[PDB]
């Protein structure tokens, strides 16, 4: 029997660190595709 409260298991990531890291990744990816280009991420689009 489940005792106490019922909630949804969750994850947290610190926003400033995450955004800065994604900025660094963008900076380093722009070298392999030319300086002036646009990069946009998007969540997974299917599968198991």
């Amino acid at each position, epitope marked *: 029997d489940i005792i106490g409260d019922i909630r949804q298991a969750h994850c947290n990531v610190s926003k400033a660190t995450w955004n800065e890291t994604l900025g660094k990744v963008v900076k380093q990816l722009r070298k392999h595709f030319g300086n002036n280009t646009i990069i946009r991420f998007a969540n997974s689009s*299917g*599968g198991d």
Partner: nanobody, 126 residues
């Protein structure tokens, strides 16, 4: 050998879903990504994405995102573990995509460029 067949073409009224099946055997099905290539009459080939049957990975084009589902079915029993079926469900199609669809694949260990091709299911819209 390398056995691959298609099924489920025809003509459909606008606003319905077209199911296209590609059934493959003769090789281990875990590897060898399926590549779904559409050929529109009067023009050279165009590519609409690919699928990976290890975990149903998909990778679409810059046009079909939100209109296509590249599903799969593996073999449940270990009796014939190399009998795979890749399904493509296309939805909400405009009148301007009467074409022929092929389920190509690639060499042993890679995916580019396509060697084997399919007889091709032809789909028309009325």
């Amino acid at each position: 050998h390398v056995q691959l067949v298609q099924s489920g073409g025809g003509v459909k009224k606008i606003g319905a879903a077209v199911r296209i099946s590609c059934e493959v055997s003769g090789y281990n099905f875990m590897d060898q990504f399926i590549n779904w290539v559409r050929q529109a009459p009067g023009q050279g080939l165009e590519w609409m994405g690919w699928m990976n049957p290890i975990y149903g990975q998909v990778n679409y084009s810059w046009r079909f995102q939100g209109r296509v589902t590249m599903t799969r079915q593996l073999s449940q029993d270990p009796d014939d573990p190399d009998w795979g079926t890749a399904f493509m469900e296309l939805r909400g199609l405009r009148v301007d995509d009467t074409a022929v669809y092929y389920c190509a694949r690639g060499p042993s260990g890679e995916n580019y460029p396509f060697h084997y091709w399919g007889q091709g299911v032809r789909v028309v819209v009325s």
